[PDB]
Ligand binder design. Structure first.
Ligand SMILES: COC(=O)[C@@]12OC[C@]34[C@H]([C@@H](O)[C@@H]1O)[C@@]1(C)CC(=O)C(O)=C(C)[C@@H]1C[C@H]3OC(=O)[C@H](OC(=O)/C=C(\C)C(C)C)[C@@H]24
Ligand SMILES: [Cl-]
Ligand SMILES: [Cl-]
Ligand SMILES: [Cl-]
Ligand SMILES: [Cl-]
Ligand SMILES: [K+]
Ligand SMILES: [Mg+2]
Ligand SMILES: [Mg+2]
Ligand SMILES: [Mg+2]
Ligand SMILES: [Mg+2]
Ligand SMILES: [Mg+2]
Ligand SMILES: [Mg+2]
Ligand SMILES: [Mg+2]
Ligand SMILES: [Mg+2]
Ligand SMILES: [Mg+2]
Ligand SMILES: [Mg+2]
Ligand SMILES: [Mg+2]
Ligand SMILES: [Mg+2]
Ligand SMILES: [Mg+2]
Ligand SMILES: [Mg+2]
Ligand SMILES: [Mg+2]
Ligand SMILES: [Mg+2]
Ligand SMILES: [Mg+2]
Ligand SMILES: [Mg+2]
Ligand SMILES: [Mg+2]
Ligand SMILES: [Mg+2]
Ligand SMILES: [Mg+2]
Ligand SMILES: [Mg+2]
Ligand SMILES: [Mg+2]
Ligand SMILES: [Mg+2]
Ligand SMILES: [Mg+2]
Ligand SMILES: [Mg+2]
Ligand SMILES: [Mg+2]
Ligand SMILES: [Mg+2]
Ligand SMILES: [Mg+2]
Ligand SMILES: [Mg+2]
Ligand SMILES: [Mg+2]
Ligand SMILES: [Mg+2]
Ligand SMILES: [Mg+2]
Ligand SMILES: [Mg+2]
Ligand SMILES: [Mg+2]
Ligand SMILES: [Mg+2]
Ligand SMILES: [Mg+2]
Ligand SMILES: [Mg+2]
Ligand SMILES: [Mg+2]
Ligand SMILES: [Mg+2]
Ligand SMILES: [Mg+2]
Ligand SMILES: [Mg+2]
Ligand SMILES: [Mg+2]
Ligand SMILES: [Mg+2]
Ligand SMILES: [Mg+2]
Ligand SMILES: [Mg+2]
Ligand SMILES: [Mg+2]
Ligand SMILES: [Mg+2]
Ligand SMILES: [Mg+2]
Ligand SMILES: [Mg+2]
Ligand code: NA
Ligand code: NA
Ligand code: NA
Ligand code: NA
Ligand code: NA
Ligand code: NA
Ligand code: NA
Ligand code: NA
Ligand code: NA
Ligand code: NA
Ligand code: NA
Ligand code: NA
Ligand code: NA
Ligand code: NA
Ligand code: NA
Ligand code: NA
Ligand code: NA
Ligand code: NA
Ligand code: NA
Ligand code: NA
Ligand code: NA
Ligand code: NA
Ligand code: NA
Ligand SMILES: [Sr+2]
Ligand SMILES: [Sr+2]
Ligand SMILES: [Sr+2]
Ligand SMILES: [Sr+2]
Ligand SMILES: [Sr+2]
Ligand SMILES: [Sr+2]
Ligand SMILES: [Sr+2]
Ligand SMILES: [Sr+2]
Ligand SMILES: [Sr+2]
Ligand SMILES: [Sr+2]
Ligand SMILES: [Sr+2]
Ligand SMILES: [Sr+2]
Ligand SMILES: [Sr+2]
Ligand SMILES: [Sr+2]
Ligand SMILES: [Sr+2]
Ligand SMILES: [Sr+2]
Ligand SMILES: [Sr+2]
Ligand SMILES: [Sr+2]
Ligand SMILES: [Sr+2]
Ligand SMILES: [Sr+2]
Ligand SMILES: [Sr+2]
Ligand SMILES: [Sr+2]
Ligand SMILES: [Sr+2]
Ligand SMILES: [Sr+2]
Ligand SMILES: [Sr+2]
Ligand SMILES: [Sr+2]
Ligand SMILES: [Sr+2]
Ligand SMILES: [Sr+2]
Ligand SMILES: [Sr+2]
Ligand SMILES: [Sr+2]
Ligand SMILES: [Sr+2]
Ligand SMILES: [Sr+2]
Ligand SMILES: [Sr+2]
Ligand SMILES: [Sr+2]
Ligand SMILES: [Sr+2]
Ligand SMILES: [Sr+2]
Ligand SMILES: [Sr+2]
Ligand SMILES: [Sr+2]
Ligand SMILES: [Sr+2]
Ligand SMILES: [Sr+2]
Ligand SMILES: [Sr+2]
Ligand SMILES: [Sr+2]
Ligand SMILES: [Sr+2]
Ligand SMILES: [Sr+2]
Ligand SMILES: [Sr+2]
Ligand SMILES: [Sr+2]
Ligand SMILES: [Sr+2]
Ligand SMILES: [Sr+2]
Ligand SMILES: [Sr+2]
Ligand SMILES: [Sr+2]
Ligand SMILES: [Sr+2]
Ligand SMILES: [Sr+2]
Ligand SMILES: [Sr+2]
Ligand SMILES: [Sr+2]
Length: 237
RNA sequence: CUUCAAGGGCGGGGAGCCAUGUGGACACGACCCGAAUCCGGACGAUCUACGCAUGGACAAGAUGAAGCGUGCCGAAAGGCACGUGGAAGUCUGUUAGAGUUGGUGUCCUACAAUACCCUCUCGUGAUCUAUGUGUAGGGGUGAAAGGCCCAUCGAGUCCGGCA
RNA sequence: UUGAGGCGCCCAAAAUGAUCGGGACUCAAAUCCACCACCGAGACCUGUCCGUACCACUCAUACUGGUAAUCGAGUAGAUUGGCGCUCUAAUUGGAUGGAAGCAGGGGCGAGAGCUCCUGUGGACCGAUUAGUGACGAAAAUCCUGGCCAUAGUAGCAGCGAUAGUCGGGUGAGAACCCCGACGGCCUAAUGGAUAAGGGUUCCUCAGCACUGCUGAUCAGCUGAGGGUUAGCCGGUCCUAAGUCUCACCGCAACUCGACUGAGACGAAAUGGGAAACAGGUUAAUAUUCCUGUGCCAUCAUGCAGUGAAAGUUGACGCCCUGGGGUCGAUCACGCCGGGCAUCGCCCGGUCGAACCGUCCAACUCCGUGGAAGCCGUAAUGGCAGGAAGCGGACGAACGGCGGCAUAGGGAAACGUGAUUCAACCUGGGGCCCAUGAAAAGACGAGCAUGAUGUCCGUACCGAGAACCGACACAGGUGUCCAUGGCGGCGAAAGCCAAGGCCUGUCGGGAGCAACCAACGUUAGGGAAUUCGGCAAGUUAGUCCCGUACCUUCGGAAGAAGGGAUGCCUGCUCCGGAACGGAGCAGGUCGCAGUGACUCGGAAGCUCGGACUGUCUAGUAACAACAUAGGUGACCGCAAAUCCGCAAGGACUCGUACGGUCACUGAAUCCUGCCCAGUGCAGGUAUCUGAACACCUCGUACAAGAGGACGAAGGACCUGUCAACGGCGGGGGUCUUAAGGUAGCGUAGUACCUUGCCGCAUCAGUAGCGGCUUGCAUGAAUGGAUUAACCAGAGCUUCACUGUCCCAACGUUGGGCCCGGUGAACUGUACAUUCCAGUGCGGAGUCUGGAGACACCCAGGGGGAAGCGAAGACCCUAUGGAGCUUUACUGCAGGCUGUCGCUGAGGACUCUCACUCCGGGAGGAGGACACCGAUAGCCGGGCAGUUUGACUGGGGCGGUACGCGCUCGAAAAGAUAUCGAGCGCGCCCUAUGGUCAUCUCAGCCGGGGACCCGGCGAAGAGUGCAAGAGCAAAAGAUGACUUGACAGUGUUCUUCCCAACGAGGAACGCUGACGCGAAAGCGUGGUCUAGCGAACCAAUUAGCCUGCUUGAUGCGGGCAAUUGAUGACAGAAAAGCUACCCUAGGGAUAACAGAGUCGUCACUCGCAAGAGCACAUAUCGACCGAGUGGCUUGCUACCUCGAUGUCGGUUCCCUCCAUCCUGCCCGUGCAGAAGCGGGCAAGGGUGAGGUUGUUCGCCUAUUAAAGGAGGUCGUGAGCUGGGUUUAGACCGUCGUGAGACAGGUCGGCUGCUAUCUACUGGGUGUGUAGGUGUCUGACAAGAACGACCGUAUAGUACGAGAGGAACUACGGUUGGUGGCCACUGGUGUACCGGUUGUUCGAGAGAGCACGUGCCGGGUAGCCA
């Protein structure tokens, strides 16, 4: 047949790419040697085209203008501290060791000094639970207990822009606009509505899949469609 | 040669070798033309699909969302009236522009290898559009019709494989 | 009275014109019995000649003689002699006293062909012999070129742009070249400036051979000259999506490839950007030249200045809105000029830039001030954290103001105020799950004077003739002018300026016919039309009143329905005002006041999809795609998913409120049951599970064999259906897990089926409601429901109408005639046909007849199975391609073990390789991971292929695909069909072999076991089909035995004849045996079925052999046994295609024709039976005999290089088996009305409701509303509703692609007539100069058909009820021909009214599509 849509994706053509040239900043944490004497004042609160959540413009003590991931409640004029012995205030970045247990945290690092990987979407938060000299157990937004290094930096508080998923898109045009700002080809034509040549579920006199939808993990790209390695399907049982 | 044995098979009392013509056979293009393929390397996004960059376009009218206001009633929460406001993949619209339902009209050696006329649809949006730019052939692109990729597509075009 | 024979008669119906070939024939020109004489082949006889064969003579196949009664046709094909062409060679010739070639002509040869003469030509040409070969054409939808008919034919008309006319000019020539006048056309374009693209097309002069839809003196044509001038307009510079180069790395390699660096490129209308305005000038340039004035940058000098870089700018989305404000437009008034002349109105102008200077609203801010309720807006809003008010800092226009300007421009005047105000300036508000460039540059940061400011573009077109589309193409092609006037809501219509044009480039003529394209008007009726209101029409703008069901409360809604609408006089209200809006009173005209133009028809029921949106560029716009919403799945990021061979990369400036992979498809109510199969995932004691390493055997080693351990995977267990999917049969469980819950239901799903009931209609296969056992409904394969929406499917009502009854008249362009220009399709030939026949069964050409004087014009298209396309349907080919899958075989990819990288101390620690994070220090991880290699599993993701044959086409079914028997089979042998009956793919250690003894079925008699006797040629038994063989046996019993043995042949069979393997049989020999006294019998079973190649393996016995050589291992071979190919003389092998493609076939199907006629229709014979009695008024079984060619079927003759489908329609002819009408006979005939029958085809046989229907059902009329043929008449006539392409849905089936003789929505209709045919019109010739009048061979007719009513008559008849006829009248209906006094239509003749706009008003006119609209309408033509 012909290569399926998921195969055209990896080629990285214009249609499947993200409008990077229209994106503001790659939100990473500031690189401090040691100490704490790094503080800044929030100049502006901007809209980030990349994640739909707001982003805070901060100017530091050493005169560095960089955008940072905005938590809830952080406004213009406010002072945020970054360092080891930073004040345990919402919006401050300090390693997981220094942050007390049972406190909601965002922009958590994987390997210490990477700039933040986990809990970065609108209104989400990671929960810090257990402490040790070796490990800091953080409960990520998916409900998974991630065992992390205590030297991994994290910003205190939940991410701003919460409850975005609550209000519906209502009309196709609103989805259109959102998708034109992301790295996604939209709209989605069902495989079952295509020809046999185009997709494993294409063909027939009526629209139904050919074989069962639950595909094996070992399936090759071109065949791996539908329910990928499903442990189960349905709602009941 | 096979064989206790027997019986069988093949060969045996000197004609061949070479040359020229000619009949016929096999491989090769194989008396000549005749078709849909398959494969290789190249040339195409001046058409068209989808994306991107930078620009441009949308008479006039209708309907009157939220919010705000004033008056009245109420302890209050509020409610009602009027006004204000001017929302909308909103309506009418041959505005510009886009599209193409019916006539199965005209044309059908055409004006035209997709045209003409009337009728019809959309027309502030998932809108239309110019230019620049990207994606290339078992690959693109596809709101999916096997649609489109320069009058070429259930696998483009050119030349080669090839007689 | 009865029998037999001969000929004839009845029985006896078919479609364009009857037939024995025709004429025609009757003591024959018939038939039968005899007879006589003739005609009539290429046969037969005969003269001569020829070829061939043979004989004699001969070197001869050279002559000559002879023989053929026993030689003389021939496709494919075998054999043989010869003709002609090119060039070579030897030998030998011809030619300027005329070669070859060509044209016409003479002679020879059976012929291929040879040769001569005359003319032409003007330089080469032969012959014989031996060679050479790019050596011979009527054909291939053959190739190239040329040419004819077609034909002086089509086109030069059709487009909302209908364009011209009269004079004159120039010229050899003028409809179209130029001037004037008159008349028109274009208004977002037909005007102005440009981008791209073109490329000299621009200007001048000279031209007409080319080009130009005719002509041309003209030109975008031909030729020659000429023409594009820049510091300040673009390029140039900057950066955008992004591109390239270099380096680096990959790659076998590169002109290849991703990342990372560096550099460069990347914007001419339309991103950013230092600077120019006014006028004049040329045939052609112009912010470029010239005049005037101005500005920018750099640099030099001089003065100033020490500031200098922070900041600002460049620099930015969509929606609403205020303020400032120019041009324009309009109003007032004044001046200048023009126009008009019943008025005094109308038009044009009244100018003046860049720049320099100056003014500043908005915003922001400061001082003052002191609001507790005030300030403020179009709106939001603002404030003791300090409102209003007052003063102030900062600060805008492409704007005002002054200069510029005793510049420029104007014939002149050379204005002033106003309103609305594009540009431009500056603010306020709102929206985003959308957040709306960058860089160079500028500012920040003065002034003089002088210098420099190079390079590239610059013409013209920019389109119904300069671009793309082969064209001077009705197509396509971006930007700015969006503010010219009236009009009106308007960038709308209509009209008109400025400007442009008469080049959407052939004309002239005919009241101008038919016919066609566009269109106007049609009385009465009003959808009767049609699949369907298709087409057309109706409605319409604005204000007032008023407005249902339902609803998601938004909507429905402009629901529906009703009223109003002009002009004139004078006014009121809102507002600063408008040349803005809203109203009032009085008067007044028309048929009509949104008077033209512009401008919705309305309502209801149902199906689908919720909605806006998307789509098959070019037959599908839809119910299909998308969508929000719903849901499931995967993944913590060193992720999941995806791309790359690699280096690397998308997602990702992303992180679960994420984004990947799928399904369902808004909201609302819901979404049952099943985990057996399949799929996915988890688990797993045990079983199974590869390679490496390890152990055993083996080999001096190795191959090799076995074991041990055992990963993923599998077995097994569990989870899971919003995962593929399933939800029945039976009974009061069974398959295979469950056994259909809510709902919905004759559905776009229901076969039956037009289901039943109801609604509605005269009538309703439709539609809607209800019922509903549902062939075969049903829950995210989503069920139900639903307001709103729709160029979606169906139905009903009101309104409207030429859709129809039923057609008419008119308008414009064609059409017809003339001038000019000038194709194409098509063509084997011949061709004046017609009716029949025949023929490969569908003939202009054959046969027989009939008809037919030639030529030409116009026509509509009957025929040429017309022209167009090597049929898409169907089959076939060891054809192709796309697609599917649990087809065959493989290839990527994923998972997993093992080896290398890889290190220290069956579970563990470490750090040093290696990986990742961190800028770094250092941190995480770590011998793992990555990578290289190998092994096992999964693996249509991808590739190559296969998927047979037979067959009354193919599929399905079957196997007549290898074998045996009987019959078919025609008394030797051979013999077919999907011919009839039926078998074999073994079985047996005895059921084989021999010998001895013996005789069986069945029956009878004596004591179904057993015993004795008799009869008993064979019916018993003999393994199994059938046919055949057998009695001291081939059967039975008994005993002994293993010949069912080894080896090698002969022959027949397999395969008649007649080649062919395996297999088989009969018959021998050699060896060894068994039995018997012996002869002898035993090469399996009495005979005919019970079977298998090569390659490879295993097995048996002996031997041969392996590369210099010996030993060992392991191999190669001679002979033979076993293992299977049943498609059985042997491939390892599944499907779909409607997305399709090719080669062919009428070798083969679908239509139709043709044959047949079982079927169908009709008839006839006999006449049981009943009809109260009565066969025969009427009905009529069984059986028998037929005719037709309307049904169906059969066959495969005709066509697959195409004979267009069903139904319908329109128009013509016919048949009779007669429905009516006429004339008749019978009656169970009183009458009336009927029933049955006969003759008869003249005429008629109609309108409607459902359905595509044919058919049929139904309604009302009727004299009756008959049937059938003409290629199921009729698509070069129409329609396109059904069938039957490509799109889609439902049900069913399928794992799937996809299918269905199921349903459903959508889905294209080519061509200029050569021949023939006919309808009409002419010109010639014949009869043989004229005028007028006739005749009538023949030809056509339906010219007429039918009904009702009155008198007869309430009469005959009949108890009555009821109720006729002859005849005479009047009318109606259908058809026919003609005519227009009358009625009616038309009447773009004409007259009137009136809306808009333009000519100033008036008068009088143009335009509004070929009349703006409305009213009336003569002639004519018409019903
Ligand atoms: C121009 O068309 C033809 O001539 C055809 O003749 C009648 C016909 C055919 C063919 O004869 C022939 O090809 C049938 C008569 C042949 C037949 O056997 C059969 O069963 C049917 C169904 C035919 C009817 C008609 O069918 C056409 O498709 C077929 O039409 C076509 O095949 C095609 C046409 C009109 C064009 C698309 C080429 C007809
Ligand atoms: Cl999303
Ligand atoms: Cl000869
Ligand atoms: Cl330019
Ligand atoms: Cl404001
Ligand atoms: K045919
Ligand atoms: Mg980041
Ligand atoms: Mg996008
Ligand atoms: Mg979808
Ligand atoms: Mg499809
Ligand atoms: Mg596939
Ligand atoms: Mg579906
Ligand atoms: Mg489905
Ligand atoms: Mg382009
Ligand atoms: Mg309002
Ligand atoms: Mg399809
Ligand atoms: Mg010689
Ligand atoms: Mg020749
Ligand atoms: Mg020939
Ligand atoms: Mg002609
Ligand atoms: Mg005109
Ligand atoms: Mg000239
Ligand atoms: Mg032209
Ligand atoms: Mg009428
Ligand atoms: Mg219509
Ligand atoms: Mg007032
Ligand atoms: Mg229906
Ligand atoms: Mg829709
Ligand atoms: Mg289409
Ligand atoms: Mg549509
Ligand atoms: Mg969804
Ligand atoms: Mg759908
Ligand atoms: Mg019904
Ligand atoms: Mg369910
Ligand atoms: Mg063919
Ligand atoms: Mg194939
Ligand atoms: Mg790294
Ligand atoms: Mg395949
Ligand atoms: Mg076959
Ligand atoms: Mg015989
Ligand atoms: Mg084999
Ligand atoms: Mg063996
Ligand atoms: Mg065979
Ligand atoms: Mg055989
Ligand atoms: Mg074909
Ligand atoms: Mg045939
Ligand atoms: Mg025909
Ligand atoms: Mg009769
Ligand atoms: Mg008749
Ligand atoms: Mg009808
Ligand atoms: Mg027919
Ligand atoms: Mg015809
Ligand atoms: Mg036709
Ligand atoms: Mg025609
Ligand atoms: Mg239909
Ligand atoms: Mg249909
Ligand atoms: Na091939
Ligand atoms: Na393109
Ligand atoms: Na309101
Ligand atoms: Na159209
Ligand atoms: Na290809
Ligand atoms: Na022959
Ligand atoms: Na002309
Ligand atoms: Na100024
Ligand atoms: Na819309
Ligand atoms: Na199951
Ligand atoms: Na079902
Ligand atoms: Na629509
Ligand atoms: Na008409
Ligand atoms: Na004809
Ligand atoms: Na194909
Ligand atoms: Na086969
Ligand atoms: Na044999
Ligand atoms: Na018959
Ligand atoms: Na028909
Ligand atoms: Na008759
Ligand atoms: Na026919
Ligand atoms: Na037809
Ligand atoms: Na047609
Ligand atoms: Sr980083
Ligand atoms: Sr990061
Ligand atoms: Sr499918
Ligand atoms: Sr459930
Ligand atoms: Sr392009
Ligand atoms: Sr508007
Ligand atoms: Sr149509
Ligand atoms: Sr036309
Ligand atoms: Sr066409
Ligand atoms: Sr029309
Ligand atoms: Sr509209
Ligand atoms: Sr809209
Ligand atoms: Sr070739
Ligand atoms: Sr008769
Ligand atoms: Sr002869
Ligand atoms: Sr002969
Ligand atoms: Sr030749
Ligand atoms: Sr030549
Ligand atoms: Sr010619
Ligand atoms: Sr004309
Ligand atoms: Sr122009
Ligand atoms: Sr001339
Ligand atoms: Sr010119
Ligand atoms: Sr550049
Ligand atoms: Sr520019
Ligand atoms: Sr204003
Ligand atoms: Sr045009
Ligand atoms: Sr067009
Ligand atoms: Sr004018
Ligand atoms: Sr012309
Ligand atoms: Sr009239
Ligand atoms: Sr109707
Ligand atoms: Sr009304
Ligand atoms: Sr399109
Ligand atoms: Sr729903
Ligand atoms: Sr299961
Ligand atoms: Sr039930
Ligand atoms: Sr004849
Ligand atoms: Sr004609
Ligand atoms: Sr058949
Ligand atoms: Sr025997
Ligand atoms: Sr199958
Ligand atoms: Sr289909
Ligand atoms: Sr009668
Ligand atoms: Sr009807
Ligand atoms: Sr029929
Ligand atoms: Sr029927
Ligand atoms: Sr007929
Ligand atoms: Sr149709
Ligand atoms: Sr049907
Ligand atoms: Sr069907
Ligand atoms: Sr004569
Ligand atoms: Sr009476
Ligand atoms: Sr007119």
């Amino acid at each position: 047949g012909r290569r399926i849509q998921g195969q055209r994706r990896g080629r990285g053509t214009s249609t499947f790419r993200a409008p990077s040239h229209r994106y503001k900043a790659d939100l990473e944490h500031r690189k401090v040697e040691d100490g704490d004497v790094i503080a800044g004042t929030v100049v502006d609160i901007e809209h980030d085209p990349a994640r739909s959540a707001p982003v805070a413009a901060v100017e530091f003590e050493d005169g560095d203008r960089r955008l940072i991931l905005a938590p809830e409640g952080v406004g213009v004029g406010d002072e945020l501290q970054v360092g080891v012995s930073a004040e345990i205030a919402p919006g401050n970045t300090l390693p997981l060791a220094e942050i007390p247990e049972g406190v909601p945290v965002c922009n958590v690092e994987s390997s210490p000094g990477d700039g933040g990987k986990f809990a970065r979407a609108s209104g989400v938060n990671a929960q810090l639970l257990t402490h040790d000299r070796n490990v800091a157990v953080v409960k990520l937004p998916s409900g998974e207990m991630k065992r992390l290094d205590p030297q991994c930096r994290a910003t205190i508080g939940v991410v701003a822009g919460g409850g975005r998923t609550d209000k519906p898109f209502v009309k196709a045009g609103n989805k259109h606009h959102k998708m034109k700002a992301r790295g996604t080809k939209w709209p989605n034509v069902r495989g079952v509505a295509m020809n046999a040549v185009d997709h494993p579920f294409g063909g027939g006199g009526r629209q139904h899949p050919g074989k069962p939808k639950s595909i094996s993990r070992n399936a090759p790209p071109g065949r791996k469609v539908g329910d990928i390695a499903s442990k189960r399907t349905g709602r009941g049982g």
